[PDB]
Chains A and B, each alone.
With several copies, the nearest count.
Chain A
């Protein structure tokens, strides 16, 4: 680990304003009047997962030419 570990927050939110605009315009056929950030399509979820800058070292028995071909891909 070249750096100390950090944590990345990412969120999943469905655009509530765009959902209401599409629901009036008819492009979204949603019969539901009220959304729910708790659960459902409009669940604004938060999830935090670790992040590391590092150098990755692995050891294996294989032909170098194919391994360098795959790793250059």
Chain B
């Protein structure tokens, strides 16, 4: 089953790339040493072979959300919105290992090297949730394959293929957003501002005195840590139309129905990260099932046999498969 979810982020996208990146105040990424630089936390970037100029494929940077992040977003969406309410409305409860296996593929960091029986493998791949995300102590193949969230851009034209010339994007799609943390105690202004503080003016003056001592120590170092922190993070600019490729090799109809229910409940979900700055908010503007567009304003339109299958399976959903899926053979 081929599912293609074209979304539109209405907030910036921030999937933080690991690394030690810096930036000048003017906006130059990774400056040579000597000039003053601030920590930059770049967004996640996929190198893509693309056609720059004419017939000259080259590796260009295109900033994305990883398929692991979107796979866990899909997993936690169908978990918080479908699977957990189905378990709550009945008497079924999960162990902490079963909850850990359902949310992160495993209960412990150490798997057991023995694989499970063919009957249990077949029944877990027939399961609506466990078939999508087959983890556990004995590693199963989950039939859900989740691609990265690619922005519909020229740099991904060898990724996107034909049919994506509408709402086209060129050029840079990222922006460095600067964030500052000020010291609260420097923003104290009067005795009315300080009355909620134990000690008041004495404690405030002690905070200024420790900041002056630490500043003198840092000046002796240059020529603990305070609360001033001016820094930067690169985000992907809002308003982009993104492609999200979801694949299912011979799924049970309830499993693709569960993916459809999760895509229905992607409303009020954040894609990558930067929670407190409301980053990752998005609007789905299209879902195509095997190339057939099945999205409307009121969620998924059509595809009814998937929804009846997943409703019947959620009615038949229990905690027994989750418990014996997470049960280690070595334990």
Q: Which residues of A contact B (CB under 8 A)?
A: 2-4, 6, 8-30, 32-35, 37, 39-41, 43, 48, 51, 53
Contact = CB atoms under 8 A, between A and B. Distances in A.
10 contacts: A3-B48, A4-B59, A14-B100, A16-B141, A17-B125, A19-B118, A22-B99, A24-B119, A34-B117, A34-B118
Nearest to A39: B108
B118 A20 contact: yes
Contacts of B48: 3, 53
A52 to B, nearest CB: 10
B270 interface: no
Contact of A22 (B17, B57, B84): B84
Interface residues of B, number: 39
Interface in B101-137: 103-106, 108-109, 113, 115-119, 121-122, 125
Given A27-B84, A34-B115, A37-B113, 4 more contacts: A8-B66, A14-B104, A19-B103, A20-B119
A24 B59 CA distance: 45
Interface of B: 17-18, 46-49, 57, 59, 66, 68, 76, 80, 84, 87-88, 93-97, 99-100, 103-106, 108-109, 113, 115-119, 121-122, 125, 140-141
A26 B93 contact: yes
A41 B118 contact: no
B100 A41 contact: yes
CB-CB nearest 9 A-B residue pairs: A41-B100, A20-B118, A20-B121, A20-B122, A14-B104, A33-B117, A17-B141, A24-B122, A10-B68
Nearest to B67: A10
A35 to B, nearest CB: 6
Contact of B115 (A29, A37, A40): A37
A50 B138 CA distance: 26
A43 B140 contact: no
A15 B103 CA distance: 8
Nearest to A37: B115
Contacts of A6: 46-47
